[PDB]
Symmetry: D2
Subunit: 511 residues, 4 copies
């Protein structure tokens, strides 16, 4: 059974209930040395699964449909989330920017790999299917399927480590073509950082041409397996509570290892085959890399709306918000929050036509978001840590402490909010702040924001390459060349400026 067959109607994406039923497919997932029977009921994934299901439910609410949905461009007569359909103007991109922000607000910016992230990949297939040559019809069909059903795609792109001392064994670790058959291709290898793949329907995977592949793999195919990292949702449930870990308990996106063990990929799922030329050209010509950072920038901007107000609430509680230096530190967090919204505005207003009527967001703004976000996030976290100087480190252990009157009587007296809040509300706000930055979930989120789109050198190199490839550097260079042409070793070459022959005193001085 195909995931899309769980829908009661072919004219709309999944509802939350249909999405949850579609995950009960015998996918192979491991956590804590055991196989997961059902992701929708398992204590490590059930609330994250319920959080994603809320996004699907919002598409069917009349009050949210103007902001979230458009009709499909397929002629099916149905509707879809705006970011699942190819943008054909700067205004289309702005409407998609707002639809992404509306979905991101349902997780307060904490879910980074929701269905709209890879919906940009579906749009890349639909806008430029001709790029894939003999696999053009696969690109067209996959765009149609993703758009109409609201299929939850992810990607597994980071390669696993290689032992430099191994013999043959080295060329077996990476995703490699092992056999070509009539039904399709047989593949083996692994990809790391398969973020929230336990809750997805499909994963896109991308001098020996056997390594030059791009294909779609279903989460329930024989040989497809996930090896999970520690679950902050399960730990928060087993040893904490929603009051103590309000983000860990519902928004944890498990960063897994995606294993492919002798997996048959049907020809209908192949996009690039034994083609080093198309693989090298895909980052620049495919469209996806020129589209997804719009989603990521908006998602971060929503998370920064949350962090900014949460920091203000935390400082109202500590009473340090009265200090000039504290207000200045909060003001800088506000400036960073404003930056990411302004970048998303520029991404849309400066959008350019691409191919087949499609529009792409401003490429310089996408690269800028990638460079600034790790620095802004690390700086904002340091600002929070140095401003809530004492308030976070000694928080009572549990909601159980508030529910024990022998303990609660002291918390009511000694842990009140400076701005008049009762102890229950003060502790609640500070626990929410701690889960955002210092819990294992908070620590993982920092590592995620810093390393998301690559190393610090790599993101800066790609920002430079974009300025060069777009012609931006040539235009900046033309201005410097003009400045240089206006003078030489003999003086000005322009008539409006005064030469120094009448005022230079060096001949008279050095005579």
């Amino acid at each position: 059974m195909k995931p899309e067959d769980f829908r009661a109607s072919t004219q709309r994406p999944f509802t939350g209930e249909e999405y949850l039923k579609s995950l009960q497919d015998g996918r192979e997932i491991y956590i804590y040395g055991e196989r997961v029977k059902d992701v929708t009921t398992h204590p490590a994934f059930r609330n994250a699964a319920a959080s994603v299901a809320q996004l699907y439910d919002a598409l069917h609410k009349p009050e949210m449909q103007d902001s979230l949905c458009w009709n499909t461009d397929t002629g099916s007569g149905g509707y879809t989330h705006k970011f699942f359909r190819v943008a054909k103007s700067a205004d289309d991109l702005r409407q998609q920017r707002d639809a992404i922000a509306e979905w991101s607000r349902l997780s307060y910016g904490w879910m980074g790999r929701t269905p709209d992230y890879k919906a940009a990949f579906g749009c890349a297939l639909g806008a430029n299917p001709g790029f894939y040559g003999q696999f053009e019809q696969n690109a067209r069909n996959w765009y149609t399927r993703i758009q109409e059903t609201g299929l939850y795609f992810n990607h597994a792109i980071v390669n696993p480590p290689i032992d430099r001392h191994l013999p043959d064994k080295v060329k077996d670790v990476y995703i490699k073509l092992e056999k070509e058959t009539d039904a399709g291709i047989i593949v083996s290898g692994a990809k790391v950082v398969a973020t929230n793949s336990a809750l997805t329907h499909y994963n896109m995977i991308g001098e020996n041409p056997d390594f030059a592949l791009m294909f779609v793999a279903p989460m329930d195919a024989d040989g497809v397996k996930l090896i999970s990292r520690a679950s902050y949702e399960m730990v928060a449930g087993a040893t904490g509570s929603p009051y103590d870990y309000p983000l860990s308990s519902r928004f944890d996106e498990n960063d897994a290892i995606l294993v492919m063990d002798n997996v048959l990929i049907p020809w209908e799922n192949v996009l690039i085959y034994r083609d080093f030329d198309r693989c090298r050209r895909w980052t620049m010509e495919g469209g996806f890399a020129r589209m997804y950072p719009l989603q990521a920038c908006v998602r971060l901007a929503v998370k920064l709306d949350f962090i900014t107000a949460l920091l203000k609430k935390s400082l109202e509680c500590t009473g340090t918000l009265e200090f000039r230096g504290v207000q200045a530190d909060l003001g800088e967090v506000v400036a960073w929050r404003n930056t990411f919204w302004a970048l998303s505005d520029s991404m849309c207003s400066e959008a350019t036509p691409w191919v087949n009527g499609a529009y792409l967001p401003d490429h310089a703004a996408l690269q800028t978001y990638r460079v600034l976000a790790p620095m802004a996030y690390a700086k904002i976290k340091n600002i929070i840590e140095r401003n809530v100087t004492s308030g976070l480190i000694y928080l009572p252990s549990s909601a159980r402490d508030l529910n024990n009157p022998q303990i609660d009587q002291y918390l009511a007296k000694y842990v009140r909010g400076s701005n008049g809040m009762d102890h229950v509300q003060r502790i609640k706000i500070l626990k929410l702040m701690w889960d955002a930055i210092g819990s294992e979930f908070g620590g993982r989120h920092e590592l995620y924001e810093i390393n998301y789109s690559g190393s610090q050198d790599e993101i800066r190199l790609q920002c430079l390459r974009q300025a060069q490839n777009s012609g931006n550097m040539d235009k900046m260079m033309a201005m410097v060349d003009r400045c240089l042409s206006e003078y030489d070793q003999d003086g000005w070459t322009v008539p409006h400026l005064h030469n120094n022959d009448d005022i230079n005193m060096l001949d008279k001085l050095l005579k």
Copy 2:
């Protein structure tokens, strides 16, 4: 004679020639212990004056007029720089953004107080004249005047220091204060500091016991108006250097002066706020100028960053270090900062809101963001340049005189070539241009200017916070946090879609 009377036509702003003639008035400027006889010929100001004159000439050039000008809204049938006329849409602001960029490119982003800077003040007077009460007609007339003529306004806003040990009488006399009220106007005395490029301006706007609660326009040639100049990088570059050695110092120096007002008569036609503490306190928020000028400043910086970015790339091509991954990454970060200020200027226009009388204001959050980011970005970009041109800047031959002496030149031709194939003349020229941008006294002054531009580091951050609070932005962010908090309590979830931990919590079994 009024400065506008130097124009041969009432249908356009000054040409460069007319602007230069208008500066040959009774202005009283001191530098190096001497009174300046004529700013347009004096070795400390002549090239900076010639650089501003080029901006005026560009307004009348067919190849530039399309990007720079619009017709006046006064019914005169004339034209003006787009930023001298009130914006009435988001598209109007984008056109003004482009017109500012075109003028800023004529100085490669190095002149920060050109006439378009205070043209936002003229627009503030025109958009909201009713704010000034009995002085409403002065606001209307000044808007008309500035717009049609392209008058070069400036301001001196920073108060001078006060000795805390002097009597209460002596400390009060230092600030701008009303001395006497007459039939012709008001008599004022005091001083303002950081009167950047006031030597080349027509008028200065001066603003904040009601005798201290004033806002007025003062001509640069009024009796009792005097400027005490700082050291001239233009004059030093001319006397001991050359355009080759100091290519920016020699033409774009904007002298940061002390503006003195010694018993100056201000006619009633030039008064905007009079003995009114309420209007003075309300002006930053309601006047409009503070909500307009950072659009000019952000664009000006973005143009300077276009210049610095490519100049850094050229310098690294010469040193040959551009082949290193870490060097390319450092240049990539400069590119990201350059991109940021352009993206902020895009948002300022696209997110513009209606104000009063059909006027539009740029996005206020984006103006505050530019003010906070610019000092950090500029200091970081300068550090990136310093640590990447590790040797190339410090030993540059002294002078174009070294290149013009064959005995010295023959060794420079052999040992100081560009790594990318440039001859020594071009290699030294590029690196001297980079040094003038960052390490010369002009380069050092520019860093101090970009860092301290719109106030202290705490003040700019406080104003960014105040804007989020006053606009309702903080209330909306707070509504999202309040919604998160309402979804659970000390007993569990308050929303039905999430699973409570009663079936998995192990603390009862573990404890007791």
Copy 3:
């Protein structure tokens, strides 16, 4: 029964066994809404208690005694840890510096509030007992007791928050004298950030003179209670393993709220009584503030030895240590690690005589350590996070994954060390790094290092005040004043320099 009565001998401090027995005293501690019966057996404290007991055991090992111990100066004929006795030379301080480093190495620098931290307070009482006036004999007796027994002292100094809108109620939150009796004083209030107080014997607590107090409070006195924060030791035990959380499982120092509810403090335990003059003078004259940062700097330097080598091991595993930029980032961590050792060298070599033959470490070096440590620690953590770009975020969940052959077979193939390490060793190293920086314990440690001795402005202000009070600023100022005296508005005032009258061209130019 007194803690010291648990020792089988009066001529040596506690052994580990005797220290553990001494904690079974009916102290009142809460965690997870429940009373703790015994800290030595409770799942939230038992390993942290066992870790402290190892320090006591090391004092009795012949192989460690040259580095750890000296004879007492009390005439008892016994021995003690070197830092529990007053230093009387620069060499004494250097020997105490080495003894602190030896004890700190037993927790790899992760235990910040071990008995040697407050041993500096015992030494402050012994070096200057005359400061306490009528309480001089209490200072002498407490120094003797702490030194001979190796009593585990802590301090509770951070005040709890105050609700600005409360009426009377405001002046009840802080530690305040409520009654003066023949036996002693009655006190009430609370102190926050009582780090590892669950494992201590005593805590030192320090216009209305009822608030101007300094006294010693036993952990088992009626009305003395601790309200604990979440236990990373218990969470690591319940949902993890030593392999998964190797630091959280044995070095967690619980940051508690210390409550004093109508506590009788006997006159023998009072050090400063209703004396605003002595309270204000104590930071500058007491000695403790001029002593404890030697312990803290050494402790951090040991933690940086650990982090530096752990980062190198982690980069060997990822294989990125081959990159120039990665080696430079590691080199900076090395430079920070070297700084804190160099500061501890200067603290000892530049030591000055104080009172009664006692020596104090260099005060400028103590203030410098306090300013630099938050910046260095935040920077080192950012270096680690941006250099282990992928390796930390997807680590398999558990030692249970390695013990399941179905999962282990893929980890053996795809998660090997780049430098030839097997997957078990690669995962182990990276989990150790993650527990140091990203676990909740790692997050708490960052908050601790940043905020330890106060806000960022406060530590910088105290560094400035030290330069001014010591005469250092006056000497730097004398050099600037000399530079200024060498010229005036007319030229040089010194004869060796050439005036510019023969070369100044301004008269000729401006004529």
Copy 4:
């Protein structure tokens, strides 16, 4: 005539007068397209020459001799600066540290290439002469010479740029290379860049196909030795300023030149390494100099930070902002950085280790730490100053000529007073001193110098890592991590004092 023959006595180093006479030789220096006739009288070098002469005079002053000098170890019965004689204990290094600080205080930390900088090279030759093989006696004789006379040595180590597009023949001719071997010595050609203060030195040490594998001593007056100077901040300050306006530029400028060697004859007595790639590669690690000079550099910077710290405090007293908590915190951080470099110099001496022939070397880890921290600390301190003197530096009156003109001076007396009660003359003087330290072209050059001092940011960090590895420090840190790892495995603790989690782990009960 040899430079040492200018001394009236063989029992002491040069006096200031004798040092100045020794510079009036055949040295060939160019500046501003002209050959310098006499460095001691030329307007670009005369005060820098006079500043170095004061250091030599201080060696013979009773009030300073106690801190600066020791007897020679040569048996001559004379004395020398402590840093010119091989250290044979940790206490010897502390005494040399203090002698360096005393000399550095005479320039307030602004002269970075004074004679004590390369005196560490003389000590490297004396401590390990056997390293040089057949040139061992040259090493011994040069140590004796440098120590007894106080010869001013320097080095030019940075190679000049090479055009990558030139033929393999042309690119090779650029670097220092052996041209011919004769009976008298060797003929060399090539160039070195960043020859800081070479115009005022006696000899330069020049070091790294075996023709390129050389180390030798070259006198500044040898035929074919030429300097091409950078712009002179001393001359510019003299021609267009005054000591009041530029108090550091006017006396402490160390010109960063290009050192050219055109068919120079180097006598065999001056050769140290000849056509030996093995000795050239080993010299950084085994020579001793690289393990000695950073003690001088760290002390010199620490003295400059004593100056900057108090100068910042004086400047903030004048602006009156020192009353603000955030301003006091910013000054407190500058104090912490100043304290760091002194603490590093203490550790360099107390942790000194024995080397060869009884010689001691400062702690190597502390030298590498100083190199990594100094560029970050200096850039941060400069940013702190710039953002805290928000207005005070940018508008300073142009000249002492303004104070000497009563018409201008009367307004400065009223409007430019110090907030702490200082008169305008003292307020402007302090702020001009601060500006010359950070924003003048001299201040800009000093920032570039401190940042790029001992190499690129990656290179200094790599050398810090290599030192931890080569010394065994990394192995010892690794032994601690290996011990932590050995205390547990995938089955639990391997140590008996800790409790395993079998009784509390809830995963079996929770899963399956």
